[PDB]
């Protein structure tokens, strides 16, 4: 018989099976379309999640048809996330070829001198090594093997990508001695131009200001917070049963009909929740800056850094460059994230508007924070 009343499904089947992610560091798996009409540029980067705060911005957005004469301006309060982005270092390149089975890698070429931080990823246990890792490779520079290698890459390739690592030693709160390694794609120009651009930059440091600027739209890829094994009430959102029932209320009561004589994959069951890969599209950059240069607005004539009183709770003080973005972002503090240029441009009016800040909150995140600087606390109390 048909059910008595209509209702929507619980949870989305776009994310089933909901299994645990394999490792905590994401690869950018998809990149925006190349265009030979533009200069050679990079398309992505790595970042670390610091924490959250709030800001006040001015706005003037209204319906184009609204008949009001006056150029109304209005304050809006918004929550923001802070990400730390030290410069990445380039250490090699890869070329790929198109086939009936997709892209396949032809060869990889590495710089003559490599850092202790990057060699540390290649071994499993840090403190137990003979360190004979890349010691024979430098001969390939003398032999001309490198010059033969570049020829083959230049002759037979469709897509070119660089290899870059992050300077973990600059962020002590991570307790980490192995760098993270990411493969990043180059768009613009021809294969030859791409290869020459790469060759000029092996061993050097690229700042985040190469890749992104204020007001840009970007996509953020990360792994969510973990929550362990959980029941259907939390995993899929199903309703709790009648209060006087035996054998438990926090369950789906009926898990199928008599035929077919099996359980369907569409029914909710208990299991893992959290620690999955998720991508957030079209987030907007409100600000870019540095952890130890003070700043001011047109209206707030105090001069202060981004760091709140006492630092972010399990991190401390930002020291390197940073990005600020609208809304919340995947995962807890200290997790690695991958940043990408937006896959396609947005038509929505909320996305394409300007941003003008007047205040940024710098009060303590432990307890009720009631001062913006140590000077105010010293003035409120005696002496």
């Amino acid at each position: 018989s048909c059910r008595n009343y209509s209702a929507p499904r619980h949870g989305s089947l776009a994310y089933c099976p909901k299994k645990r992610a394999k490792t905590t560091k994401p690869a950018i798996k998809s990149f925006p379309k190349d265009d030979a009409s533009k200069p050679v540029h990079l398309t992505g980067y790595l970042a670390y999640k610091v924490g959250m705060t709030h800001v006040v911005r001015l706005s003037t957005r209204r319906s184009k048809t609204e008949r009001v004469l006056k150029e109304t301006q209005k304050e809006v309060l918004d929550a923001v996330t802070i990400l730390e982005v030290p410069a990445m270092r380039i250490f090699g390149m890869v070329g790929y070829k198109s086939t009936v089975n997709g892209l396949k890698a032809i060869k990889t070429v590495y710089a003559e001198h490599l850092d202790e931080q990057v060699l540390a990823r290649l071994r499993k246990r840090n403190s137990r090594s003979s360190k004979l890792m890349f010691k024979l490779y430098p001969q390939k520079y003398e032999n001309g093997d490198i010059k033969r290698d570049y020829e083959l890459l230049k002759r037979e390739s469709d897509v070119v990508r660089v290899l870059a690592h992050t300077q973990v030693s600059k962020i002590p709160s991570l307790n980490l001695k192995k760098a993270h390694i990411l493969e990043i794609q180059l768009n613009g120009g021809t294969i030859e131009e791409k290869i020459e651009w790469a060759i000029e930059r092996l061993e050097k440091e690229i700042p985040v200001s190469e890749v992104f600027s204020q007001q840009d739209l970007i996509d953020v890829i990360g792994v969510t917070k973990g929550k362990g094994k959980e029941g259907t009430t939390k995993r899929f959102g199903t309703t709790i049963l009648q209060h006087k029932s035996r054998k438990g209320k926090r369950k789906v009561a009926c898990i199928g009909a008599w035929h077919p004589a099996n359980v369907r994959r569409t029914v909710a069951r208990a299991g893992q929740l959290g620690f999955h890969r998720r991508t957030a599209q079209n987030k907007k950059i409100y600000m870019m800056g540095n952890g130890k240069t003070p700043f001011s607005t047109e209206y707030d004539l105090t001069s202060k850094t981004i760091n709140p009183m006492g630092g972010f709770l399990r991190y401390g003080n930002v020291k390197s460059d940073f990005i600020m973005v609208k809304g919340g972002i995947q995962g807890p503090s200290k997790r690695v994230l991958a940043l990408r240029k937006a896959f396609a441009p947005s038509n929505l009016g909320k996305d394409n508007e300007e941003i003008v800040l007047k205040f940024v909150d710098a009060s303590s995140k432990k307890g009720y924070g009631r001062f913006q600087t140590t000077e105010e606390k010293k003035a409120y109390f005696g002496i």
Binding site: V56, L77, Y368
Partner: protein, 65 residues
């Protein structure tokens, strides 16, 4: 930037925190937190709550008008 000054405690309130309570007498009043709103309801006199800026001024621990 401040939201204002708390009615009961005397404490200045940061922008984006605290709440206004509006009575049927038609008055609007600003409180720092739920703590001090509740003390008003229970008719605890502020001068007896010794950490308040009000109490400290009344005792003459802090220079005031």
């Amino acid at each position: 930037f401040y939201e204002g000054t708390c009615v009961y405690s005397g404490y200045p309130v940061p922008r984006g925190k605290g709440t206004y309570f509006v009575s049927l007498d038609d008055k609007s009043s600003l409180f720092f937190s739920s703590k001090y709103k509740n003390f008003s309801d229970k008719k605890i006199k502020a001068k007896r709550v010794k950490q308040t800026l009000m109490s400290k001024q009344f005792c003459g621990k802090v220079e005031s008008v």
